[PDB]
Amino acid sequence: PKVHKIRITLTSRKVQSLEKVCQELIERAKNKDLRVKGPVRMPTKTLKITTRKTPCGEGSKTWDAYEMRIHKRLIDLTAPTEIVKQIIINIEAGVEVEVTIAA
Amino acid sequence: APVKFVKVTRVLGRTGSRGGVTQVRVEFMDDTTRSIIRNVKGPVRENDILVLLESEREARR
Amino acid sequence: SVQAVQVFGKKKNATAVARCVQGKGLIKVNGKPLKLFAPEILRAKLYEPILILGTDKFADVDIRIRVAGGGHTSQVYAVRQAIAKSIVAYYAKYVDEHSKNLLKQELIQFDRSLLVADPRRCEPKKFGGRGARARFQK
Amino acid sequence: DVLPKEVLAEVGSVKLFNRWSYDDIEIRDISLTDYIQIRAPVYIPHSAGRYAVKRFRKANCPIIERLTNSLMMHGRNNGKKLMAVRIVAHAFEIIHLMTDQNPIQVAVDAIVNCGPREDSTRIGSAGTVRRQAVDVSPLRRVNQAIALLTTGAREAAFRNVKTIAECLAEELINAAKGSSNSYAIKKKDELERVAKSNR
Amino acid sequence: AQHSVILDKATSDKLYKDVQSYRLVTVATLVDRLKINGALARKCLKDLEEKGLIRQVVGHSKMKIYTRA
Amino acid sequence: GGVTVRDVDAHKFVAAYAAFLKRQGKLPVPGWVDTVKTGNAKELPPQDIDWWYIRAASVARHVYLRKTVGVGRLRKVHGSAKNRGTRPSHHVDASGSVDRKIMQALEKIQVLEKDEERGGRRITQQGQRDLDRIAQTVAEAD
Amino acid sequence: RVRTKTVKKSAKVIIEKYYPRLTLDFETNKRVCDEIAVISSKRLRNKIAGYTTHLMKRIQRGPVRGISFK
RNA sequence: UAAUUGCGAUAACGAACGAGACCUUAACCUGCUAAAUAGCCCGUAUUGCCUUGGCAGUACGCCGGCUUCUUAGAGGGACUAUCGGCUCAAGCCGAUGGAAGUUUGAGGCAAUAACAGGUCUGUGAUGCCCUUAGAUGUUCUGGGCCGCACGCGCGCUACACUGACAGAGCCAGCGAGUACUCCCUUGGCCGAGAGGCCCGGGUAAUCUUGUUAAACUCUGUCGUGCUGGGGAUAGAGCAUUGCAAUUAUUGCUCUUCAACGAGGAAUCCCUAGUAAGCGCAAGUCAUCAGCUUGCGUUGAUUACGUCCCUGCCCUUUGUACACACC
């Protein structure tokens, strides 16, 4: 049982679904008497595309701005290697998760 | 020239074809009994003081 | 322990964070003293919080300020705001506010903008700032 | 210590300009007060005010600020207020040596004298003009006086060996009295003359 | 219209007998009535400065003004 | 009391440091003077004859205040706008050789040294105290 | 600054259903409204609270037509 | 009243769309939840100067403390509240407080009925007609779309001293970035210059990047002369991109030094961080932005109106018009 000081990164487009994942994940580890470090707030990355409305070029000239936003909220923990497998189970749609032992 | 000083006591609408001119009621501030009607070109508030080169012209309406 | 309080002043995009520590009457901004950090003609807009109040009221105060972002004249408006906020915040915490209320009332009577910021930003538009392109035949 | 030795000279006395005090203001006329603001002194004119939100809010503003802003025009000089403040300060020194009076003493009398008192208004006559020769409000008088003084200096210094520092200075002393050889006086009397005809 | 880049005795004497009465002396003034070039006017400006006849009021990279002593 | 670089006006300090290096009289010169443009954006060589020496004094002044600097950073620090003709102007950087050799020659004067641990050039133990000593030449000059 | 029918109609029913529970104070009336009503916007709730406290100020001096409470 | 927004009157009563509500964003929180891919105080080590006890920097801490500044979550905050003056009412005008009092500021979405508006050259959406092996299919070589006595539109650079040139001083924000092949690029050396070579970082709040941009500020030179204002036109040389640069792709050095002195009749845009000045990022992209979509810096003059011109909405009224005053 050797601690490896794990770190977990998250990504999703929704904002409400992602937040409650961390809320239950921190509680799933806190009750197990594990020293947990806070849910840092990474910058939101917004990317946009602008294009002209008309498909032929006639008439007045008008554009529209599409948008897309991403949030991260990465988390890290100090725990053994095998225990962390059972703590990240039962995740819902939308949120993507990446595991790093950070040994 | 016997230039006279007057002070504004009331503003009465905006006249003119394009609203540039305004119509005010003035007070001679030396003989408080007399009062006439004049026209002014610029922005005007109550208790403003105006200078009159001649005091016998009056104005329409 | 040591008596200190932190205040900040803002402009369009100029942030001036300041820490006032009980000292001996020394004021320096970005390391350099007040002799340097300003355009020569704009140096006048830095001393007002002192003359209106008096140098005798800066007997044992030390101030260090770090400022970044914005422009030349925007920055000097931020730092002059931090000086006013530093002296009034330190007085509230550690000494009777009879000075502070007298400090606050006198300071804003000369100029309200010394203690409060002016909210102003730009507006995006699809023609430029606010004007459109030229028309051919109306 | 923390302040330069120069400013320690004035801190003991009443607050004032770089050199000149706003005390001993003229007693010459009426109807021009309440629109030229000198009760609140300013060290340097430059200020980020809120004078363009209401009707008469800009009436409560130092005249030097009003003069300084109007000095920068004609495309090239847009937003270059730092240059304008330097010109005003240097011009104020030039007039001081040629006349023992205060530089603001000259500037105030220049404005109060070059403001037209009557003007002709445009009333349609189906292609003709029924100029009625209306009166002028005090606020417009000071606003138009500033424009006349500044545009005269800007015209003279164009393609001239002289600089705007003293071209502006020489007009103010000219406009202090009835010199009649200044740009402002030439236009002011011309406007009043045509108004009399259309009475 | 054109001025003189060199200073002769006909112009040198003009300085030392007339500048004692000037209220202001500037680059424009010398080019105006002395009919001399601006470069010479600046040269004439600094040489007499140390001679102790005029005093500086304000100094700047744009304009310079001097008055009586 | 004690003074440092930050305690003196920048314009007179660099001028003062130009005067000191006259009396020391030991700064390498590679013959580039009187021919170089000091920048692609420009058109005329510098007017003042001892421009190679006044620039070095100012260059060593900011390295005293900056932690790591290289030739590339100084190339664009000294750049300015270029008149491309009738097209709108842009921003281009200064010459590389001028700024590179002015600090390569400044290496052997024992003013600042290399920083191979992470890159760039930093100020040396005895280099920084030399520029501190000339500060008192200006502060009490008052 | 004129209030529409949704603000005015909703204010009428609140006053007659719960007259004594809310008073001339604007701050207290703000907390009365959200407990006894379903409002989907904070700004909409503020406007409703603003009008109902205005109505009772003139109620204090004589009744007004269009209003009836027990 | 910004509004068929309301107060109300009423042969009408009760309702459905549009407006408003609403959604994104810009301004406020020393209160909550926090953070070595964001900072500060503090403690070690260490440097210079006064020496004091000081002042200004360096490197380290990973449970030493903390969250004002940075960051994104949960919520709070304005309702015209309070005060004074008009009115029966809906409401309007001024002041005080306050981060904020025009619907707080700026946007997204947006009804019925229509036009012979634009698009078959966006679509493997599509009727009919046409050509289909000497092809209107596809593909390879070469050229053209840029050809110039002339008229018109959207822009760029200027006619200088409120300027040009030379040294020094020195302040932003929104964004983009590595494959089955190199995409943004720090540092070192060589090189007048543009460029070249060798290690290396970053799939990115971690590296480029503090993108120390331009205008601007201080000190000098030139001196009103179309002159050191202005950079069109043209010769020669050295380089980079690509399979290929001539009808020059673009970039750098030397030389050539045109018109143009504030512009006729006419005419476009605009109300506060707004006009104008100046630069940066992205889009198209092997290379080329004087164009567009966004970002910040500096920052004003003038109105707080009217229906006179060019037009819009509702009512009364006239008509020989209904393809509707062309």
Ligand SMILES: [Mg+2]
């Ligand atoms: Mg735009």
Ligand SMILES: [Mg+2]
């Ligand atoms: Mg703009």
Ligand SMILES: [Mg+2]
């Ligand atoms: Mg344009």
Ligand SMILES: [Mg+2]
């Ligand atoms: Mg331009």
Ligand SMILES: [Mg+2]
């Ligand atoms: Mg809105």
Ligand SMILES: [Mg+2]
């Ligand atoms: Mg073509």
Ligand SMILES: [Mg+2]
């Ligand atoms: Mg590699």
Ligand SMILES: [Mg+2]
């Ligand atoms: Mg970093």
Ligand SMILES: [Mg+2]
């Ligand atoms: Mg020429």
Ligand SMILES: [Mg+2]
């Ligand atoms: Mg590009």
Ligand SMILES: [Mg+2]
């Ligand atoms: Mg195009």
Ligand SMILES: [Mg+2]
């Ligand atoms: Mg009839």
Ligand SMILES: [Mg+2]
């Ligand atoms: Mg009919």
